């Protein structure tokens, strides 16, 4: 026969651990399609010789686009 | 030899208490009253 079984309350840790993957799934979802996006669409740059007299700026010295900006 | 008549007797109060304690801590055909 089904009985009763004492526990201490469960609602609390469970509240606490929804809400805190929520934040982080809130902010780092998109965060993942971006850099996804970006390896996709933009990706590294390859290495190339300096031009003649050129100058590169600072940036181009990097080959990850997020590393760039 | 054995229990006194106090010990016998308080032995039986505490036994009915605690029989109807262990009776009421079944669930009734509900109990589990889930929400949607
Ligand atoms: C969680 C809730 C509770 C809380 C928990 C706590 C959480 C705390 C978190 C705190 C926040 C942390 C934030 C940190 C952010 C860090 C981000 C970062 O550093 O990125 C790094 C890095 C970024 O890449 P990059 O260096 O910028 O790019 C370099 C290249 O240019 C790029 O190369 P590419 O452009 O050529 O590649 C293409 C591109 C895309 O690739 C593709 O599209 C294709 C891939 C190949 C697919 C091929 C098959 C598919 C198609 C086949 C079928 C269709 C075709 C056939 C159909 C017809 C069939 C007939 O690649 C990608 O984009 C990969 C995905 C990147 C995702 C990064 C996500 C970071 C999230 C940061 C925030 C964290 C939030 C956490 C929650 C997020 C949700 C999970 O991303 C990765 O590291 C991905 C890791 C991949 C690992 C591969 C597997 C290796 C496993 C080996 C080890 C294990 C062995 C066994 C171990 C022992 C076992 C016993």
Redesign the pocket.
């Known amino acids: 026969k089904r009985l009763f079984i004492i526990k201490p309350s469960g609602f609390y840790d469970r509240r606490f651990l929804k809400l805190?993957?929520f934040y982080?799934?809130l902010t780092?979802?998109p965060?993942?399609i971006g850099?996804?996006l970006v390896?996709?669409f933009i990706?590294?740059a390859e290495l190339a010789d300096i031009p003649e007299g050129y100058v590169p700026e600072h940036w181009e010295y990097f080959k990850?686009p997020?590393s760039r900006w | 030899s054995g229990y006194t008549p106090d010990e016998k007797l308080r032995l039986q109060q505490l036994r009915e208490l605690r029989r109807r304690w262990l009776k009421d801590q079944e669930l009734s055909p509900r109990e589990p009253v889930l929400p949607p």
């Open positions: 805190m993957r982080i799934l780092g979802i965060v993942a850099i996804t390896n996709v990706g590294e990850h997020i």
